[PDB]
Design an enzyme around this catalytic site. Structure first.
Site, short mmCIF file in Angstrom:
data_model
loop_
_atom_site.label_atom_id
_atom_site.label_comp_id
_atom_site.label_asym_id
_atom_site.label_seq_id
_atom_site.Cartn_x
_atom_site.Cartn_y
_atom_site.Cartn_z
N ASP A 186 0.80 -1.23 0.00
CA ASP A 186 0.00 0.00 0.00
C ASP A 186 0.82 1.26 0.00
OD1 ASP A 186 -1.88 1.90 0.37
OD2 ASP A 186 -2.77 0.99 2.19
N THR A 187 1.02 1.85 -1.17
CA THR A 187 1.81 3.07 -1.30
C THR A 187 1.13 4.25 -0.63
OG1 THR A 187 0.87 3.54 -3.49
CG2 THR A 187 2.87 2.27 -3.44
N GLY A 188 -0.15 4.16 -0.32
CA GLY A 188 -0.90 5.21 0.33
C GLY A 188 -0.83 5.11 1.86
C1 LIG Z 1 -6.94 0.95 4.37
C2 LIG Z 1 -6.77 0.55 2.91
C3 LIG Z 1 -7.07 -0.94 2.73
C4 LIG Z 1 -7.71 1.40 2.03
N1 LIG Z 1 -7.43 2.79 2.02
C5 LIG Z 1 -6.34 3.28 1.22
C6 LIG Z 1 -5.08 3.56 2.04
O1 LIG Z 1 -3.95 3.64 1.16
C7 LIG Z 1 -5.17 4.80 2.92
C8 LIG Z 1 -5.15 6.07 2.07
C9 LIG Z 1 -5.25 7.33 2.94
C10 LIG Z 1 -4.16 8.18 3.07
C11 LIG Z 1 -4.22 9.29 3.90
C12 LIG Z 1 -5.38 9.57 4.63
C13 LIG Z 1 -6.46 8.75 4.42
C14 LIG Z 1 -6.42 7.62 3.62
N2 LIG Z 1 -4.05 4.83 3.86
C15 LIG Z 1 -4.13 4.64 5.17
O2 LIG Z 1 -5.16 4.39 5.83
O3 LIG Z 1 -2.91 4.71 5.76
C16 LIG Z 1 -2.93 4.69 7.20
C17 LIG Z 1 -1.72 3.84 7.60
O4 LIG Z 1 -0.59 4.70 7.46
C18 LIG Z 1 -1.00 6.05 7.67
O5 LIG Z 1 -0.64 6.82 6.52
C19 LIG Z 1 -1.77 7.41 5.92
C20 LIG Z 1 -2.89 7.26 6.91
F1 LIG Z 1 -4.10 7.14 6.37
F2 LIG Z 1 -2.88 8.38 7.64
C21 LIG Z 1 -2.51 6.05 7.75
S1 LIG Z 1 -8.73 3.78 2.19
O6 LIG Z 1 -8.25 5.17 2.20
O7 LIG Z 1 -9.44 3.33 3.40
C22 LIG Z 1 -9.79 3.55 0.81
C23 LIG Z 1 -10.81 2.62 0.73
C24 LIG Z 1 -11.56 2.54 -0.46
C25 LIG Z 1 -11.32 3.37 -1.55
N3 LIG Z 1 -11.98 3.27 -2.71
C26 LIG Z 1 -10.26 4.26 -1.48
C27 LIG Z 1 -9.59 4.33 -0.28
#
Ligand SMILES: CC(C)CN(C[C@@H](O)[C@H](Cc1ccccc1)NC(=O)O[C@H]1CO[C@H]2OCC(F)(F)[C@H]21)S(=O)(=O)c1ccc(N)cc1
Ligand SMILES: [Cl-]
Ligand SMILES: [Cl-]
Ligand SMILES: [Cl-]
Ligand code: NA
Lengths: 99, 99
Positions: free
Chosen positions: B25-27
């Site tokens: 997960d690059t996000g």
């Molecule tokens: C959890 C994952 C299976 C799905 N997510 C995408 C992630 O890449 C999300 C993308 C994301 C990034 C930033 C804020 C919100 C969401 N990152 C995330 O939750 O990372 C968390 C862990 O490390 C931290 O760094 C970012 C964080 F969030 F803070 C923490 S998501 O945002 O819930 C998501 C779910 C469904 C859709 N269509 C799009 C996104």
């Protein structure tokens, strides 16, 4: 390009005539953008997250420009804390994970 | 390898001698895994995404194999919906995004 992951992979996108910054997110199935107006029809959706769901508007057949590359697909609009480009549009620009 | 994004980028990880499935997960800034037992002390951390924030336990200097590549670093444990390999360990395995 080749993007390392020492920092968040942020890029400029153009959507709805607007420039925004967005996160290239291989862990997102779909693309989710902060509140903005888009043309055409939409339907409600719930999308999951690490902490639970948010309600979004689903717009289909939206064109985005992602770091200079044109794609078309579904865009979800709602109270996401960050604009995220998910796999539905990363595939269209030919993005891959390499190691 | 080169991983396309037409499906979720799921790989096998090994942590505490157990195989698990996890999402590259690059996000995600951080690696977050579902409830399990890890050795040593932990520290508190707050991490947030769609649907809000979750409380997690931060374990440092944990040995983890990711798709056959060794990493040693921080693992967060908490109520994540799927095991997520974030950028802190993606950088250790040499992953880049390319398009
Ligand atoms: C959890 C994952 C299976 C799905 N997510 C995408 C992630 O890449 C999300 C993308 C994301 C990034 C930033 C804020 C919100 C969401 N990152 C995330 O939750 O990372 C968390 C862990 O490390 C931290 O760094 C970012 C964080 F969030 F803070 C923490 S998501 O945002 O819930 C998501 C779910 C469904 C859709 N269509 C799009 C996104
Ligand atoms: Cl789509
Ligand atoms: Cl605590
Ligand atoms: Cl680390
Ligand atoms: Na439409």
């Amino acid at each position: 390009p080749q993007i390392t992951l020492w920092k968040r992979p942020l890029v400029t996108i153009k959507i709805g005539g607007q420039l925004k910054e967005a996160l290239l997110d291989t862990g997102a199935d779909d693309t989710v953008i902060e509140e903005m107006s888009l043309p055409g029809r939409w339907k409600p959706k719930m999308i999951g997250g690490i902490g639970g769901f948010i309600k979004v508007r689903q717009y289909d057949q939206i064109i985005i420009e992602i770091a200079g590359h044109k794609a078309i697909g579904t865009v979800l609009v709602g109270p996401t804390p960050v604009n995220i480009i998910g796999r539905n549009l990363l595939t269209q620009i030919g993005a891959t994970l390499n190691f």
